[PDB]
RNA sequence: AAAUUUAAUAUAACUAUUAAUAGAAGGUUACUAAUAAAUUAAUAAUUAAUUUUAAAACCUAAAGGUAAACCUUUAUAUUAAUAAUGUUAUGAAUAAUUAUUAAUAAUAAUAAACUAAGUGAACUGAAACAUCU
RNA sequence: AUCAGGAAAAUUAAUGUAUACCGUAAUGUAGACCGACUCAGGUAUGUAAGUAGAGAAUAUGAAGGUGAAUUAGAUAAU
């Protein structure tokens, strides 16, 4: 479905002579089916491998033997300053090591976790109990 | 007054609030969400404290640059595109993950300490370790590591243990 | 008689402890009174009233003209000797209570009488007094070393 | 000439009708509770 | 006129859209007497003086501690080509002491050996 | 000896010479600050030697100075705070009044 | 715009009220929205929460 | 062989009855106040059940105040013990800062109806009214 | 003079100081407050050019401010 609607010069593409342009309207998945000259209809979704899509992708079953694969995820060349490179991201710079010196300074604890937290409660000692009961 | 009278420094620390020397990051010059992914908690889990700190600071810096830009977009042009906002949100998520991991590590350490304090189990653990370790150079290395880990009362105890080990071998 | 305004009082059942959001700073010196403190004729909590309270009834004329009136017990402030405490204890005292005390032979005796009725018709102050006396007695009987 | 009976002064108004004033006294507490039960959005100045 | 596009007398206000409104609303710094001081969680820093001044106490003044060894290679985002990692913890919780002990033992045996040095990994860790 | 202002100035100078802090670092360390600052464009009244930021409502002047030095290696010599009024805004007119942010 | 709304979250309750409009009066708001958008921006499909 | 209608069902109404089961956060504005597992069953991802676990700003009579969402205390606390450090007076003594270990307190937001108890009107009815109601 | 006139928180010496938070627009004898209205009402304090004069009376007005959500004509009776 592609409706023809008059669009401003702001949103013009390099070529559009008239203000009139044809553009695609969205469609509900319920109103369109899978092809493979075929029409799938019902899909099962039971098994589930991981593509390395880099995610655990389920199997599309039509009749559970016939599997239709997911399409090929488009390649993507990362060349941004704000994205760290893979190897660096993945590297290991912390092993548990000690049981005497903590991993983080005493002074940095307030930053990562709230003292004066009103949900602490704690206690419930024997001495305390003794103190309360008459 | 004229600006020719000035000599605006090129490496002035206030340029650090912009991407490169640029008023707005263009739609083309932003990192698209297809490429960018926020840091995972598990992945972070094995990262040093210093490195984590550095990462956090970097994130903050990035947010600042986004933040300014976002403000400009909102207040002046009055745009609703919110790419910058999304980016900021992503950064925030990462930051929170980092924070969580930091907390978690501390908690783990505390737990370990508690376990150690329970003297019945700790002794058993030590014994098991000894058994496991019982090459000579390799043993020495392992023993050295153990000593380091151990490292006034505690120190004394460690020393005693070392002595005992030596006696045994 | 009936102890309706005593044995009807109810206090928040304590949860026993094998912590609470707000624990008190001090230590409960005295044992909890079963029936608690009276929220009805609070004048009574200061002393020994014998479970007597203010009644409210009708003044009635020769024309049967009703008009609300109250009835007070005959309270008297009275310093009375306690052998166990070794001092005179002054308190508010319904004259009935005084009479009872006289009959029974001493304030300690009155306090330390076992029956549930007696317990009911002590106040919180009365209860405290009883605790003091019995504890003292125990101490007298039983030094730390036999 | 009547009509101008309300002579605003922020101090007086917060001190008399303010949330803190209400919450401090038993009667005030009652009022606040009443307003909560009605579901009023604004419990007092 | 106040505004020349409205010539005729309409139901328009000198400023704004309505004189009235909810007056029972949290008050800010700007409103109140001279004596009304609101404050904005900014200064529990020092101590006021007997005379009106303010003596700062630095044992309580927030400073921000940037790490001296800045790893600039760590960036706010990560490459999409890296899949998200999924730790496993069958030996109850990541903050389980037993697991930590095991890890320590492993470290002692080995000494700084990387588990996810291979960038090509769905789940791992024990 | 000499008076207080002079002393302060001297201290500042010394700090500058050193290439460290030109102000007494508070013995109160925060490691992971969530705060952010917006760099604003300069008004007609501001010089090129002045820059201004929108900062947290709960931000201290001292804190801002510290923050700039540590995160951005920027030496802020003098700092001036300006808290802005929140004006009442209302959308529908059937909807309640409320104030816009007090911004610092 | 010229607001500073983005820097704050104020009128939180009000926002919630206007954000979480009961679903049976969703037709109303949506109609208005439809009315106040150009032909190229608007779409015939109903939003999901 | 797909569509159309009819009747029933939602996370998405309230009201009355009957039957079953059980007895529970609001606000304010921002340096926004996030989660992490395990085990068992179903079939590596899975959903469910059973669990442990992180965070969680400020206010909502009683840390102590106030003009609710602020201020003031100062658990990035004090004391002790030690360790590196600079100064002074005579290897020993005194004070200052940082760092580890130990000791020492922390936060009344909590319903409503129902129940029991204390006090307890009057209008009204009596074709007036006071006994009575 | 008679009317008889507030309350409450010390010195020296040695050692010190990096100076927090908030108010700050404009309006304020008013179109920006209280009066249902851009309402001849109500609303606290200081300075209030000279000339003149007993004065903050009264006249003028240097400077500053203002000439307005009704105009234009006509001006019967009233
Ligand atoms: Mg009125
Ligand atoms: Mg009064
Ligand atoms: Mg008005
Ligand atoms: Mg004002
Ligand atoms: Mg005050
Ligand atoms: Mg009753
Ligand atoms: Mg007027």
Query: Considering Cα of A73, then A78, then A83, then A84, what sign does the dihedral take?
Result: positive
Could you tell me which chain A residue has the CA closest to the CA of F34?
A: A111
Question: How far apart (Å, rounded) are the C-alpha atoms in residues D7 and B150?
Answer: 75
Rounded, the Å distance between the CA of A107 and C1' of H100 is 13
Question: How far apart (Å, rounded) are the C-alpha atoms in residues C112 and C133?
Answer: 8
CB atoms within 10 A of CB G25: 9
What are the Cα distances from residue E18, in Å, to D41, E26, F101?
20, 19, 20
**Region label for A40, one of left (φ > 0), alpha (ψ between -120 and 50) or beta (otherwise):** alpha
Question: How far apart (Å, rounded) are the C-alpha atoms in residues C91 and C77?
Answer: 5
Residues on chain G touching F98 (C-beta within 8 angstroms)? 10-11, 14
Residues on chain G touching B75 (C-beta within 8 angstroms)? 1-4
Rounded, the Å distance between the CA of D7 and C1' of I43 is 9
Cα of first residue to Cα of last residue in chain B, in angstroms, is 85
Q: Which residues 114-133 of A interface with strand H at a CB distance below 7 A?
A: 114-120
Give the number of beta-carbon pairs within 8 Å between B and E: 101
Using CB atoms within 10 A of its CB, is residue B4 exposed (0-12), middle (13-18) or buried (19+)? Answer: exposed
Q: Are A92 and E116 in contact (CB under 8 A)?
A: yes
Coil, helix or strand at residue G48? coil
Question: Given an 8 Å threshold on Cβ–Cβ distance, is A6 in contact with G45?
Answer: no
Q: Is residue G41 within 8 angstroms of chain B, CB to CB? A: no
Distance of alpha carbon C49 from the chain centroid:
7
Q: Which G-chain residues 9-28 have CB contacts (< 8 A) with chain F?
A: 10-11, 14, 18
Cα of first residue to Cα of last residue in chain A, in angstroms, is 81
Q: What backbone phi and psi angles, to 5 degrees, belong to G10? A: -130, 150
Using CB atoms within 10 A of its CB, is residue E96 exposed (0-12), middle (13-18) or buried (19+)? Answer: middle
Q: Are E105 and B145 in contact (CB under 8 A)?
A: no
Question: How far apart (Å, rounded) are the C-alpha atoms in residues C38 and C5?
Answer: 8
DSSP 8-state assignment for residue A69: P
SS (H, E, C) chain B: CCHHHCCCCCCCHHHHHCCCCCCCCCCCCCCCCCCEECCCHHHHHCCCHHHHHHHHHHHHHHHHHHHHHHHHHHHHHCCCCCHHHHHHHHHHHHHHHHHHHHHHHHHHHHHHHHHHHCHHHHHHHHHHHHHHHCCCHHHHHHHHHHHHHHCCHHHHHHHHHHHHHHHHC
CB atoms within 10 A of CB C40: 14
Q: Is the CB of A69 under 7 A from strand H?
A: no
Rounded, the Å distance between the CA of E2 and C1' of I51 is 40
Q: Are B35 and A76 in contact (CB under 8 A)?
A: yes
DSSP 8-state assignment for residue F103: B
G1 has which bridge partners?
Answer: none
Q: Is residue G3 within 8 angstroms of chain F, CB to CB? A: yes
DSSP 8-state assignment for residue A4: E
Question: How far apart (Å, rounded) are the C-alpha atoms in residues G31 and G36?
Answer: 9
Contacts 24+ apart (CB under 8 A), C23-27: C23/A128, C23/A132, C24/A132, C27/A131
Q: Are B68 and B19 in contact (CB under 8 A)?
A: no
Question: Given an 8 Å threshold on Cβ–Cβ distance, is G10 in contact with F95?
Answer: no
CB atoms within 10 A of CB A127: 8
Residues on chain E touching F88 (C-beta within 8 angstroms)? 16, 21
Coil, helix or strand at residue E19? coil
DSSP 8-state assignment for residue A103: S
In sequence order, what DSSP letters do the residues of F34-88 get, joined into one string?
----EEEPPPTTS-TT--EEE--TT--HHHHHHHHHHHH----------PBPPPE
Q: Is the CB of E103 under 7 A from strand H?
A: no
Residue F46, C-beta contacts closer than 8 angstroms, at least 6 positions apart? F52
Cα of first residue to Cα of last residue in chain E, in angstroms, is 80
A56 has which bridge partners?
Answer: A50
Question: Given an 8 Å threshold on Cβ–Cβ distance, is E41 in contact with F58?
Answer: yes
Rounded, the Å distance between the CA of B107 and C1' of H56 is 17
**Quick one: resolution in A?**
3.2
Of A39, A41, A60, A61, the residue nearest A51 (C-alpha): A60
Of the partner residues E79, E81, E116, the one whose CB lies closest to the CB of residue A92? E116
Torsion of CA C79, C81, C84, C89, to 10 degrees: 0
Query: Considering Cα of E5, then E9, then E14, then E15, what sign does the dihedral take?
Result: negative
Torsion of CA B47, E76, B39, A113, to 10 degrees: 70
Q: Which F-chain residues 11-50 have CB contacts (< 8 A) with chain A?
A: 29-33
Question: How far apart (Å, rounded) are the C-alpha atoms in residues A130 and B82?
Answer: 60
**Going by beta carbons, is chain F in contact with chain A, meaning 3 or more pairs sit under 8 Å apart?**
yes
Q: What backbone phi and psi angles, to 5 degrees, belong to A110? A: -50, -35
Distance of alpha carbon E29 from the chain centroid:
23
**Going by beta carbons, is chain C in contact with chain E, meaning 3 or more pairs sit under 8 Å apart?**
no
Give the number of beta-carbon pairs within 8 Å between B and F: 41
CA of E7 to the centre of ligand 3 (A): 23
């Amino acid at each position: 479905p592609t409706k023809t609607v008059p669009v401003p010069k702001q949103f013009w593409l390099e070529g559009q002579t008239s203000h009139m342009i044809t553009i695609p309207v969205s469609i509900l998945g319920k109103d369109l089916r899978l092809v493979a000259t075929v029409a799938v209809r019902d899909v099962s979704f039971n098994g589930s491998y991981y593509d390395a899509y880099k995610k655990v992708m389920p199997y599309r079953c039509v009749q559970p033997d016939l599997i239709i694969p997911w399409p090929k995820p488009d390649p993507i060349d990362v060349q941004t300053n704000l994205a760290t490179d893979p190897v660096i991201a993945r590297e290991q710079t912390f092993w548990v090591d000690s049981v005497v010196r903590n991993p983080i300074p005493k002074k940095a604890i307030p930053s990562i976790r709230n003292p004066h937290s009103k949900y602490k409660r704690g206690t419930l000692t024997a001495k305390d109990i003794a103190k309360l009961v008459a | 007054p004229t600006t020719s009278n000035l000599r605006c420094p090129d490496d002035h620390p206030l340029w650090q609030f912009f991407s490169n020397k640029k008023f707005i990051r263009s739609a083309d010059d932003l990192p698209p969400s297809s490429h960018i992914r926020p840091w995972s908690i598990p992945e972070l889990r094995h990262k040093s404290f210093n490195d984590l700190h550095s990462l956090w600071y970097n994130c903050l810096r990035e947010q600042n640059v986004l933040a300014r830009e976002n403000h400009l977009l909102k207040n002046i042009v009055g745009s609703t595109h919110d790419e910058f906002s999304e980016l900021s949100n992503s950064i925030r998520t990462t930051m929170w993950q980092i924070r969580h991991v930091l907390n978690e590590r501390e908690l783990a350490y505390s737990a370990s300490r508690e376990f150690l304090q329970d003297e019945s189990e700790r002794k058993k653990f030590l014994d098991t370790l000894a058994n496991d370790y019982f090459d000579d150079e390799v043993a020495s290395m392992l023993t050295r590591f153990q000593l380091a880990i151990f490292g006034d009362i505690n120190f004394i105890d460690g020393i005693k243990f070392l002595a005992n080990l030596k006696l045994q071998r | 008689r009936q102890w309706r305004l005593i044995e009807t009082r109810k206090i928040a059942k304590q949860p026993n402890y094998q912590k609470p959001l707000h624990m008190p700073k001090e230590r409960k010196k005295f044992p909890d009174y079963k029936y608690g403190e009276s929220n009805i004729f609070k004048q009574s909590n200061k002393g020994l009233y014998g479970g007597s309270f203010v009644q409210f009834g009708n003044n009635i004329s020769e024309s049967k003209a009703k008009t609300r009136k109250k009835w007070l017990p005959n309270v008297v402030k009275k310093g009375l000797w306690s052998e166990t405490l070794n001092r005179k204890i002054s308190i508010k005292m319904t004259a009935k209570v005084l009479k009872t005390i006289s009959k029974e032979g001493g304030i300690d005796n009155y306090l330390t009488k076992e029956k549930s009725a007696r317990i009911k018709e002590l106040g919180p102050t009365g209860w405290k007094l009883r605790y003091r006396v019995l504890k003292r007695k125990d101490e007298i009987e039983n030094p730390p070393h036999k | 000439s009547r009509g101008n009976t309300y002579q605003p002064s922020t101090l007086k108004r917060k001190r008399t009708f303010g949330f803190l004033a209400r919450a401090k006294s038993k009667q005030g507490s009652k009022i606040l509770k009443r307003r909560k039960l009605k579901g009023r959005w604004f419990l007092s100045h | 006129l106040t505004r020349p596009w409205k010539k005729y007398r309409d139901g328009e206000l000198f400023y704004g859209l309505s004189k009235v409104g909810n007056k029972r609303v949290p008050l800010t710094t700007k409103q109140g007497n001279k004596t009304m001081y609101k404050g904005t969680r900014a200064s529990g820093i020092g101590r006021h003086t007997k005379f009106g001044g303010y003596v700062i106490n630095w044992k309580k003044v927030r400073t921000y501690v940037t790490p001296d060894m800045v790893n600039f290679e760590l960036k706010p985002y990560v490459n999409a080509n890296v899949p998200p990692l999924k730790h496993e913890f069958k030996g109850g919780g990541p903050l389980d002491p037993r697991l930590q002990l095991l890890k320590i033992k492993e470290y002692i045996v080995n000494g700084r050996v990387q588990s996810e040095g291979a960038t090509d990994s769905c789940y791992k860790e024990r | 000896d000499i008076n207080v202002s002079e002393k302060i100035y001297k201290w500042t100078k010394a700090g500058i010479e050193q290439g460290k802090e030109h102000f007494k670092v508070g013995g109160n360390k925060v490691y992971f600050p969530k705060a952010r600052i917006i760099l604003l464009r300069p008004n007609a009244k501001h010089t090129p030697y002045q820059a201004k930021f929108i900062v947290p409502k709960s931000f201290n002047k001292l804190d801002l100075r510290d923050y700039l030095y540590h995160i951005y290696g920027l030496r802020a010599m003098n700092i001036t705070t300006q808290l802005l009024h929140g004006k009442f805004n209302r959308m529908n007119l059937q909807t309640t009044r409320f104030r816009e942010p007090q911004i610092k | 715009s010229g607001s500073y709304q983005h820097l704050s979250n104020v009128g939180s309750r009000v926002m919630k009220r206007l954000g979480n409009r009961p679903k049976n009066f969703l037709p109303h708001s949506e109609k208005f929205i439809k009315k106040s958008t150009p032909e190229f921006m608007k779409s015939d499909l109903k939003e999901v929460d």
